[PDB]
Coordinates of C-alpha atoms and ligand atoms in Angstrom, one line a residue:
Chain F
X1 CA 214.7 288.3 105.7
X2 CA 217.4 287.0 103.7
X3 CA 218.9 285.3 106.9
X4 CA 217.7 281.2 106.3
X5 CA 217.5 278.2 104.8
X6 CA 216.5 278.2 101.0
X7 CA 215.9 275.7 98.0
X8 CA 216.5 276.5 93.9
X9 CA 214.4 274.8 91.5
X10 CA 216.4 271.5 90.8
X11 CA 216.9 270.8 95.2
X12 CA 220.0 272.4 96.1
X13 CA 220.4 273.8 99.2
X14 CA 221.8 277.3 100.2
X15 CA 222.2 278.3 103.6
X16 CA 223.0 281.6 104.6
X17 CA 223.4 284.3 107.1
X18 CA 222.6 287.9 106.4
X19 CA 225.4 289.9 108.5
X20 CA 224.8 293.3 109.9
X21 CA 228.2 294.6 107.4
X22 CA 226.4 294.1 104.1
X23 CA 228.1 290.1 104.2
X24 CA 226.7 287.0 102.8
X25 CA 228.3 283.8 104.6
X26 CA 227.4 280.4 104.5
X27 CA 226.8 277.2 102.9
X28 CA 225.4 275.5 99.5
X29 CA 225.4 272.3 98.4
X30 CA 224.5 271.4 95.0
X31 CA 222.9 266.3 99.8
X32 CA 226.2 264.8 101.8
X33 CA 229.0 266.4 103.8
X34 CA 231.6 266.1 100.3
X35 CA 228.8 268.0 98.4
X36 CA 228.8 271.6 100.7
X37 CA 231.1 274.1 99.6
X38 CA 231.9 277.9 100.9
X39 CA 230.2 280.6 99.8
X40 CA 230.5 284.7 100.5
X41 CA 228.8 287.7 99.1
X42 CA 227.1 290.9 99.6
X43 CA 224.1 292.4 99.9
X44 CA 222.0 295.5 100.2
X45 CA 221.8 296.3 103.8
X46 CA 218.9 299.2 103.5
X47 CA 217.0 298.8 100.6
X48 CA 214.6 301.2 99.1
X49 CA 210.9 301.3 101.2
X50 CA 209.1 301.4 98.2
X51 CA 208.1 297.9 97.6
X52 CA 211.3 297.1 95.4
X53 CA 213.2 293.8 96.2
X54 CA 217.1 293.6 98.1
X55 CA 220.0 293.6 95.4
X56 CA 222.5 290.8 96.2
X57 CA 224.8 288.2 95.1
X58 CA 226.9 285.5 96.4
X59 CA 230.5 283.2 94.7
X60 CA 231.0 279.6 95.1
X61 CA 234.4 277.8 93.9
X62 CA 233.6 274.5 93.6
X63 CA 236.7 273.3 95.5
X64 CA 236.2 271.5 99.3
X65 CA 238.2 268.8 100.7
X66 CA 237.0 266.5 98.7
X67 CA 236.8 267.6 95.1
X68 CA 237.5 270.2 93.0
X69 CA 235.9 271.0 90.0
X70 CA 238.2 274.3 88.9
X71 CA 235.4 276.8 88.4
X72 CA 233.3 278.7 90.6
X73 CA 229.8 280.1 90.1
X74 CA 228.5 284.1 90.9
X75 CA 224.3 284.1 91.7
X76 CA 223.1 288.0 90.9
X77 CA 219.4 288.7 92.0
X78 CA 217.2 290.0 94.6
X79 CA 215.1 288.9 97.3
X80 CA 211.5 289.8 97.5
X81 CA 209.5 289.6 100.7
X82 CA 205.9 288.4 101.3
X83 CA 204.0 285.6 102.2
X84 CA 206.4 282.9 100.6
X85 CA 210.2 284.6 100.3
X86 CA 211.8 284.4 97.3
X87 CA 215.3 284.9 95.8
X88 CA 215.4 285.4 91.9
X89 CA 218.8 284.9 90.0
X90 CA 220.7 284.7 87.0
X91 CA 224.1 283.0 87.5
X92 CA 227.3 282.2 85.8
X93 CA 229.4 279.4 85.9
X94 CA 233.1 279.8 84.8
X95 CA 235.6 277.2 84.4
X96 CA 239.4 277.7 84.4
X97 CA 240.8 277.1 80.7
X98 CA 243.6 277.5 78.2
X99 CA 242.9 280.7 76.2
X100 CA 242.1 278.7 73.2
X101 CA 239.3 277.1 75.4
X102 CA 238.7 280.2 77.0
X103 CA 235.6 281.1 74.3
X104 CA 233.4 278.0 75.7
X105 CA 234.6 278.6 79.5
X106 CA 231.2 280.5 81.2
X107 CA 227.9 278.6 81.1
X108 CA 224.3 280.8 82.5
X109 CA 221.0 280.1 83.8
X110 CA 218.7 281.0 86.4
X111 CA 217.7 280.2 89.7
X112 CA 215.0 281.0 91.8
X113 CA 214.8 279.6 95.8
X114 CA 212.0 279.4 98.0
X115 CA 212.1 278.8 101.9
X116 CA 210.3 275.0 101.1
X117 CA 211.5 271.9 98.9
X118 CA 210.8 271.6 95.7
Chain E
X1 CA 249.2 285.9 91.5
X2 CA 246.2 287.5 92.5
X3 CA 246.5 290.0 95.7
X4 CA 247.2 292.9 94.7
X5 CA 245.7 296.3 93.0
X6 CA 243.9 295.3 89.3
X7 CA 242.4 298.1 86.8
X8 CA 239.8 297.7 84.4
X9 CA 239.0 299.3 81.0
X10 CA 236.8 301.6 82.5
X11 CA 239.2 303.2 85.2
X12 CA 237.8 301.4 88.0
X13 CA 240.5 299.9 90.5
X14 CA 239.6 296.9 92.1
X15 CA 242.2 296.0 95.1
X16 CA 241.8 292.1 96.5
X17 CA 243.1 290.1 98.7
X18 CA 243.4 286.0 97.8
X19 CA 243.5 284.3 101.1
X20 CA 244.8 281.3 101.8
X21 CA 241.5 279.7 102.7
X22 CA 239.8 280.7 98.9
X23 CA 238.7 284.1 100.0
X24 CA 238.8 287.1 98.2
X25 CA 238.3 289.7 100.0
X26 CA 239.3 293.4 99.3
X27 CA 237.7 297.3 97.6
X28 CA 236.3 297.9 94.6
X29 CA 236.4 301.7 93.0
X30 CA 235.4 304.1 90.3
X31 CA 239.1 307.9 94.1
X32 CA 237.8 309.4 97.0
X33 CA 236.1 307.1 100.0
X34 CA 232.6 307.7 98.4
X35 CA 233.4 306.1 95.2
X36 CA 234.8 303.0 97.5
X37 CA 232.8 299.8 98.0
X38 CA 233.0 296.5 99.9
X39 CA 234.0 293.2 98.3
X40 CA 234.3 289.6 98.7
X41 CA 234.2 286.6 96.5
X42 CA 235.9 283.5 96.3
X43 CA 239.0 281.2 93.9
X44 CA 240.1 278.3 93.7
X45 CA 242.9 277.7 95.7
X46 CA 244.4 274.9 93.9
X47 CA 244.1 275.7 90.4
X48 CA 245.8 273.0 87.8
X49 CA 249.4 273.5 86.8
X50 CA 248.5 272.6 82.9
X51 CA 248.1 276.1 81.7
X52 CA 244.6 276.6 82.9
X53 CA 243.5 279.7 84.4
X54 CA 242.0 280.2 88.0
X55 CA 238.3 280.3 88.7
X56 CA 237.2 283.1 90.5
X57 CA 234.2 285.4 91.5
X58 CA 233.4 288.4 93.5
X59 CA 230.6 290.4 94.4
X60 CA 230.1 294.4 95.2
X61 CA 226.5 295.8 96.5
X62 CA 226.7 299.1 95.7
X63 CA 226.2 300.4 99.2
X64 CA 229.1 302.2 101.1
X65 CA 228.4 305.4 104.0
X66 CA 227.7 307.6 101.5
X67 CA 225.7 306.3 98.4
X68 CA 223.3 303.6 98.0
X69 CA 222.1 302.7 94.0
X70 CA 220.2 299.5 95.6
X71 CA 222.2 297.0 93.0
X72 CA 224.8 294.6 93.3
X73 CA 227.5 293.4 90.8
X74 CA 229.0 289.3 90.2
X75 CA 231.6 289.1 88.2
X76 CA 232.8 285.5 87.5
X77 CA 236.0 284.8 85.7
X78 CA 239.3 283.3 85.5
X79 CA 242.9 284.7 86.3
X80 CA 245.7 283.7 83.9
X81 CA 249.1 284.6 84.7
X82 CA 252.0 285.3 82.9
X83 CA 254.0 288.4 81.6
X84 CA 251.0 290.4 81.2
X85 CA 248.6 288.7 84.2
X86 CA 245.1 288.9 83.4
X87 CA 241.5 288.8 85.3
X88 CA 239.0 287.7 82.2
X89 CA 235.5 288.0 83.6
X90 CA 231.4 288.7 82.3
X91 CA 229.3 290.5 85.1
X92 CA 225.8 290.6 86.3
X93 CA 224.6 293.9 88.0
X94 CA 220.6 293.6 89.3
X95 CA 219.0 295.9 90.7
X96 CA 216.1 296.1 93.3
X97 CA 212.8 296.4 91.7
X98 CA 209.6 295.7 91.7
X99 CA 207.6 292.6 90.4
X100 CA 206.3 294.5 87.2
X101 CA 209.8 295.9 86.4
X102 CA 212.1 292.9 87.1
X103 CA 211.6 291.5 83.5
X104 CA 214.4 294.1 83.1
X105 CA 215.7 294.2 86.8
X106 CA 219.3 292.7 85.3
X107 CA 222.3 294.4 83.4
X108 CA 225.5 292.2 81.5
X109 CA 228.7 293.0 80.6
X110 CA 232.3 292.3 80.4
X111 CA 235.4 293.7 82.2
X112 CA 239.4 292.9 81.8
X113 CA 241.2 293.5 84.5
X114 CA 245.3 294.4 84.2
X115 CA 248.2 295.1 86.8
X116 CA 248.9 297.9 85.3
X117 CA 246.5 300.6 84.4
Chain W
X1 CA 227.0 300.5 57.0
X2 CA 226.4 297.3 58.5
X3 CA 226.6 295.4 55.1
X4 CA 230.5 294.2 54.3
X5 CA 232.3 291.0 55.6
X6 CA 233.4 291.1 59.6
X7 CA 235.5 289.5 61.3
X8 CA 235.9 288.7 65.3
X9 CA 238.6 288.5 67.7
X10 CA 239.0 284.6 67.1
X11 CA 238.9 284.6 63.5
X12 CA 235.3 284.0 62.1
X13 CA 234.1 285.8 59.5
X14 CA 230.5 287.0 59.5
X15 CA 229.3 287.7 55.8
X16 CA 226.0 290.1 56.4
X17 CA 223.7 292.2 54.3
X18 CA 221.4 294.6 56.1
X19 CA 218.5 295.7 53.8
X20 CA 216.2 298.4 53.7
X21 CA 213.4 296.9 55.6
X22 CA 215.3 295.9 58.9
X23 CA 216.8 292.4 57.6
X24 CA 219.8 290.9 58.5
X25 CA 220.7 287.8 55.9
X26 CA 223.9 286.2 55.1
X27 CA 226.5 283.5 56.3
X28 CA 228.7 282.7 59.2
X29 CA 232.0 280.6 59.4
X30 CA 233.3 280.0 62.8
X31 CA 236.7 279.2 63.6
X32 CA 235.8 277.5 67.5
X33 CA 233.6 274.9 68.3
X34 CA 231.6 271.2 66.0
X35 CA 231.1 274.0 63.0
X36 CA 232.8 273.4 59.4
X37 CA 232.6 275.8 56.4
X38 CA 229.6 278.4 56.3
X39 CA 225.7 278.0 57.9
X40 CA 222.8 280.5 57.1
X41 CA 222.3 283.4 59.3
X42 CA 218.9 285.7 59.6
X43 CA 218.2 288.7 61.7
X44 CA 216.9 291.8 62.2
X45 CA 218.7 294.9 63.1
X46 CA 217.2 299.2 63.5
X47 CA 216.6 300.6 59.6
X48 CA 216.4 304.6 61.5
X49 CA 218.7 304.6 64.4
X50 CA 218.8 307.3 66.8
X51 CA 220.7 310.7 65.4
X52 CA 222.6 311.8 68.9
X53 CA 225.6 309.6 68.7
X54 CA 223.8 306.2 69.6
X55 CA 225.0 303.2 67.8
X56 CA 222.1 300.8 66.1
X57 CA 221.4 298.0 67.6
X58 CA 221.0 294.3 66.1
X59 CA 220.7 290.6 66.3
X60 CA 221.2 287.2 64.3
X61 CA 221.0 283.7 64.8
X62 CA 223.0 280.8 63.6
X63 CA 221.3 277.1 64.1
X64 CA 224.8 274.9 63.5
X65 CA 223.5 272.9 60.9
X66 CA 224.7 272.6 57.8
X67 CA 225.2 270.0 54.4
X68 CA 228.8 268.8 56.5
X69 CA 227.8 268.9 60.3
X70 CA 225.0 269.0 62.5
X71 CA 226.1 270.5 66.4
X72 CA 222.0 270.6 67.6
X73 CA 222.7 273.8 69.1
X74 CA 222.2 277.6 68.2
X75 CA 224.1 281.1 69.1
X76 CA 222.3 284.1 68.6
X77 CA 224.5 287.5 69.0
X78 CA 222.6 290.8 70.5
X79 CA 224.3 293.8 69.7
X80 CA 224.8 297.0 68.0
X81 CA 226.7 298.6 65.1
X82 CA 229.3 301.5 65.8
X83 CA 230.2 303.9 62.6
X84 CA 233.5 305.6 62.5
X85 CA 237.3 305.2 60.9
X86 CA 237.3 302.2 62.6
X87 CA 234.1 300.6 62.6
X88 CA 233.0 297.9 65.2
X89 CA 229.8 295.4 66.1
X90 CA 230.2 295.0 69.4
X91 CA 228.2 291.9 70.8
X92 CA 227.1 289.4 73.6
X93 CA 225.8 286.3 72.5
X94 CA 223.9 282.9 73.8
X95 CA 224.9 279.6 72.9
X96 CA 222.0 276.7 73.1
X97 CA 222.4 273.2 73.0
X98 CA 219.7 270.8 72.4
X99 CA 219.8 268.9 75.6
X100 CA 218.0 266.2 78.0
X101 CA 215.5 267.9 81.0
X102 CA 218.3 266.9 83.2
X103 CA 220.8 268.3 81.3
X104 CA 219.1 271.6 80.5
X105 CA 221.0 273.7 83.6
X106 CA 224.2 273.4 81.7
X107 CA 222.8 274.0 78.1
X108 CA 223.6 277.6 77.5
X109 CA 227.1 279.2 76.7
X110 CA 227.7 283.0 77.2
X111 CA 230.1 285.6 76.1
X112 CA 231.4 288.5 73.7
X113 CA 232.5 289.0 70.3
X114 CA 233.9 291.7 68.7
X115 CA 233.6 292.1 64.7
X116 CA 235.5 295.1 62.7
X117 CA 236.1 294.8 59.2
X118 CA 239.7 294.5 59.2
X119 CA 240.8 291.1 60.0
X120 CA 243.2 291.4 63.4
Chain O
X1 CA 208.9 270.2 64.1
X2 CA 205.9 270.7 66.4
X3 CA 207.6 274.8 66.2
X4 CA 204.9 276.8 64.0
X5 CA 201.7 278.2 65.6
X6 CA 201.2 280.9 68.1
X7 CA 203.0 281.1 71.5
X8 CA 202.6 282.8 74.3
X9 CA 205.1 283.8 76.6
X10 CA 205.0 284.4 81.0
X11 CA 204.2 288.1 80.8
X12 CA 201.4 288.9 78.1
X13 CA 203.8 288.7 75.0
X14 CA 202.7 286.4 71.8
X15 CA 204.5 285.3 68.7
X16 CA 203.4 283.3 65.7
X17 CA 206.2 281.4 64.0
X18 CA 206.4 279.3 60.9
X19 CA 209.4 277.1 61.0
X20 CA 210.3 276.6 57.6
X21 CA 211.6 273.1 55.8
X22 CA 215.6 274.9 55.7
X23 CA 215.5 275.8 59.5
X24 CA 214.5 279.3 58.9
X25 CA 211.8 280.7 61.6
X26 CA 209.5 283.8 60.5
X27 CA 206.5 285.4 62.1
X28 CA 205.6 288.3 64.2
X29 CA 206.2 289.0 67.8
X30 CA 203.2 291.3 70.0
X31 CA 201.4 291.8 73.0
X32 CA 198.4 290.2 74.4
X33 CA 195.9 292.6 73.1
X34 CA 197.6 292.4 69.3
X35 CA 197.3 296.0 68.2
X36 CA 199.3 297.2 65.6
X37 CA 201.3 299.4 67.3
X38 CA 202.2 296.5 69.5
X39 CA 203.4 293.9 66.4
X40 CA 207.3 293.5 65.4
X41 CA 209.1 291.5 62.3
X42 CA 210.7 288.2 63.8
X43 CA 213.4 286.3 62.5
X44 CA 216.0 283.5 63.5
X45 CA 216.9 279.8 62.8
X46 CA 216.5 276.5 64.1
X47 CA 217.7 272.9 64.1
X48 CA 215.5 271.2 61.4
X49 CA 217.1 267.9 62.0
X50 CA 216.9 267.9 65.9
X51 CA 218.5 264.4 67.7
X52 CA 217.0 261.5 68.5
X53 CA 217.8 260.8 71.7
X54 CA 215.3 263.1 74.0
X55 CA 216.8 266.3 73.4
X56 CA 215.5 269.3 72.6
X57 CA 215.6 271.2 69.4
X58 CA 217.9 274.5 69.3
X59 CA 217.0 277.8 68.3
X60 CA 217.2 281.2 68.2
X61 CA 215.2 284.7 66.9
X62 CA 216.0 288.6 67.2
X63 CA 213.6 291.2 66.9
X64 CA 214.0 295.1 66.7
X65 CA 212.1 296.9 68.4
X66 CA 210.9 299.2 65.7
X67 CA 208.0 299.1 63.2
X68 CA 206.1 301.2 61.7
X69 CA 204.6 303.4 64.6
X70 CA 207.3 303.4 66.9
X71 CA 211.1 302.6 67.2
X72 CA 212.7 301.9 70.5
X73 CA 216.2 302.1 69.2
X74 CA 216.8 298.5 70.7
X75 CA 216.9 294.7 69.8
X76 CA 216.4 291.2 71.7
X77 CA 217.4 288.1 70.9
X78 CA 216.3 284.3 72.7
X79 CA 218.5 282.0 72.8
X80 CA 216.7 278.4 73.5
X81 CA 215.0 274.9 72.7
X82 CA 212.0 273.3 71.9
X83 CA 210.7 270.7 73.7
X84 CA 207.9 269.1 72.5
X85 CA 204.7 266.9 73.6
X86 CA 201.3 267.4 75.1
X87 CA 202.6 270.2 77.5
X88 CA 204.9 271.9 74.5
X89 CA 207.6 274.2 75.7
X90 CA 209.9 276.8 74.3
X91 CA 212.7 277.4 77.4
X92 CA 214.7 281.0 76.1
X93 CA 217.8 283.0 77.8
X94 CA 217.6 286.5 75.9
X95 CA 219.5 289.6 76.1
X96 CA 218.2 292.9 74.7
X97 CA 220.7 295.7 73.6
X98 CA 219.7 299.4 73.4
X99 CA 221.8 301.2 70.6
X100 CA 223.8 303.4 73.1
X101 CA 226.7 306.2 72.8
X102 CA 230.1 305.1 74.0
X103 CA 230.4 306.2 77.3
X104 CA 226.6 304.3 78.4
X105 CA 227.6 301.2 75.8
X106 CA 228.8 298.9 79.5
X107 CA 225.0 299.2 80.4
X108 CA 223.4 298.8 77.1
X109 CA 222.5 295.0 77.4
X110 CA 220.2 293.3 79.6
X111 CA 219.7 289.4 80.3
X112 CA 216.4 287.6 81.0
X113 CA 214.6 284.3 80.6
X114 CA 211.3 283.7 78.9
X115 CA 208.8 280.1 78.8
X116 CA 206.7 279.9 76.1
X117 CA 203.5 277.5 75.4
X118 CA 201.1 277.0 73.3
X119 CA 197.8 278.0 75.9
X120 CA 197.9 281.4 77.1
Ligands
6FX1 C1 230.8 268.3 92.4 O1 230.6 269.5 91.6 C2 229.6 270.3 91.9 O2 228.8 270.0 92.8 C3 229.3 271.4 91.0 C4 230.2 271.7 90.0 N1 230.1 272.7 89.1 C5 229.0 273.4 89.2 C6 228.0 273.2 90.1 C7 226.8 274.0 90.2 C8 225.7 274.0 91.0 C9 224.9 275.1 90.6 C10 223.6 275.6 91.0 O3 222.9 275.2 91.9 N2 223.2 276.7 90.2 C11 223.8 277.3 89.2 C12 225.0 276.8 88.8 C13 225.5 275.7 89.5 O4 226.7 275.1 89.3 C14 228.2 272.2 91.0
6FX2 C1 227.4 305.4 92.5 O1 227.1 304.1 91.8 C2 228.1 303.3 91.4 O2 229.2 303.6 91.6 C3 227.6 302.2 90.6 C4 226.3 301.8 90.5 N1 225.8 300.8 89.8 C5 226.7 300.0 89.2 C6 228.1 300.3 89.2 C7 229.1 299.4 88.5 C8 230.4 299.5 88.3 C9 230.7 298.3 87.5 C10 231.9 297.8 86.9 O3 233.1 298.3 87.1 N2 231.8 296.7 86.2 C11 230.6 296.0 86.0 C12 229.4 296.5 86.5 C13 229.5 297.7 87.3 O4 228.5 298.3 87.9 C14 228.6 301.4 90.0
6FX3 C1 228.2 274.3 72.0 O1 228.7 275.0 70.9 C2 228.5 274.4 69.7 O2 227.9 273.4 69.6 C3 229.1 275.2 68.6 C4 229.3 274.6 67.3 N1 229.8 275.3 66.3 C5 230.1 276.6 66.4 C6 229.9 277.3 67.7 C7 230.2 278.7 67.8 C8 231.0 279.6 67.1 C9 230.9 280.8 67.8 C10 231.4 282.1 67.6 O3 232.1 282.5 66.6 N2 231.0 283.1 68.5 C11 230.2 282.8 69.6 C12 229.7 281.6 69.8 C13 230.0 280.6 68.9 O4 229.6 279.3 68.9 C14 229.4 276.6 68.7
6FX4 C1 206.3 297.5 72.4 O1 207.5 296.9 73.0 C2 208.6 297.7 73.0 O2 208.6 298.9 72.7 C3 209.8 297.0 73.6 C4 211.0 297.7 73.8 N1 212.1 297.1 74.3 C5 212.0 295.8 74.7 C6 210.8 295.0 74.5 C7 210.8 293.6 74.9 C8 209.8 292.7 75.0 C9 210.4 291.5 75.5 C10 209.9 290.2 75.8 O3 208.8 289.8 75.6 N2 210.9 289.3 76.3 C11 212.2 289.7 76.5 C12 212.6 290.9 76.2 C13 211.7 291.8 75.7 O4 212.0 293.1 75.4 C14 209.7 295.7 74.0

């Protein structure tokens, strides 16, 4: 299931733990100790039995003990079972501004993670 | 500035709780128990003091006892303080489908959130 | 109608003429961002919109080059047209920079604009 | 500019572009199979004087989803660059609104990405 180890496109690593509440928890590191960061979410704990995929969607705030970037990025997608696992996002990344700034604050782009290295 | 009870544009009432580890953690609505879903996202903790606001995301999979829409909602945004305190976000709302219809598997949007409704 | 001079929330003013056959033409001056004076705009938006209360939709892009300035980057708004005493184009838009492989991740801005045709 | 021809996108969908001399991009957007029914008007903009450096080239096109057989009531427009070479690329984040009554307008626009190339 969702419950794993997975890869995006560009190497980063996302480790997380499917709970039986609906709860996302774990890790991702966009690979050293100062590069992991927190990350919670949610996710659809009974999905439809009709072949569709399993809403979910998970925050990072790019703030450890070691930097802090002052933004955080949401991932919204799905995962879809089969032979080789996938989760498909889209994602936005949104930096803390002045309002004048405030116009140019949110960058987006997508993300897809398999169970292997890319 | 952030725990607390926030209203949107649309009448929803989104009610969070900023820890002091970066969780946020809290209920999101649109009144009753069966309009009431689970929440959690994270901030950051040590925003700058330069008049910059405070990164933050949260998530809702629209699942609860009652109702299931198989979807989930992001929303990523900043909080700015102030007189009239603001949560400034854009959302993303997917839904579970299959291969042939995920082309269009993915909804976005926009909410404000206020203190007062 | 959609043809008239708009303006959004930050203060750009969007000069548009929609014709007969689905064509969005005119010029764009934004008050953010590397953009001076007007650029070209071209789009298309629906000639025979829906008659139970839907708005029309639309689209244009702007590439943000121009005789004064060149940004190598694009934004596009996707949206639709709203009639009434207060008329509104209500919009989300893409921002694209020209960018390195390495650099694509981080080469799209998003967001919102909101254009009625009295200046606020 | 390395832009005009005939591209084809993940899913089945094909557009032929000209990218004109002032940065203007015309053409026609269809399905695999090219009927009629199937073909749109396609307009937007690119950067006709694109860097230097290894960057791509921004751009941007809307169509509306209505022609002469049919009429969706809806428009999408990609947001993207060029990047040429043997293996030719157009890399697009689009978002496609539906002309929508007030009270469904929060759900009106959805958000995707598209690759296009020059082999189908
Ligand atoms: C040291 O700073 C960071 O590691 C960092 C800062 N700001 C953003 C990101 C990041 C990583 C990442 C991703 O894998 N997918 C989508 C968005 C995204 O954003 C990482
Ligand atoms: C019974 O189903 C629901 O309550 C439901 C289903 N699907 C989506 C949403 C919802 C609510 C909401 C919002 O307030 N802002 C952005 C997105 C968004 O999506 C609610
Ligand atoms: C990275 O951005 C640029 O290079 C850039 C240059 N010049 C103007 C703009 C601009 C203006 C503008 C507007 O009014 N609404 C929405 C987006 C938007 O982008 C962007
Ligand atoms: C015949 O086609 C239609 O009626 C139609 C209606 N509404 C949307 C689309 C369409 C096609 C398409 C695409 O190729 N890439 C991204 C978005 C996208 O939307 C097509």
């Amino acid at each position: 299931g969702i419950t794993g180890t997975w890869y995006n496109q560009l190497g980063s690593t996302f480790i997380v733990t499917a709970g039986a509440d609906g709860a996302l928890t774990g890790t991702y590191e966009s690979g050293n100790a100062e590069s992991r960061y927190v990350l919670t979410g949610r996710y659809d704990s009974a999905p439809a039995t009709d072949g569709s995929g399993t809403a979910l969607g998970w925050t990072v705030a790019w703030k450890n003990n070691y930097r802090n970037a002052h933004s955080a990025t949401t991932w919204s997608g799905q995962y879809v079972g089969g032979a080789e696992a996938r989760i498909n996002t889209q994602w936005l990344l949104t930096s803390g501004t002045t309002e004048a700034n405030a116009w140019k604050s949110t960058l987006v782009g997508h993300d897809t993670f398999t169970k292997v290295k890319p």
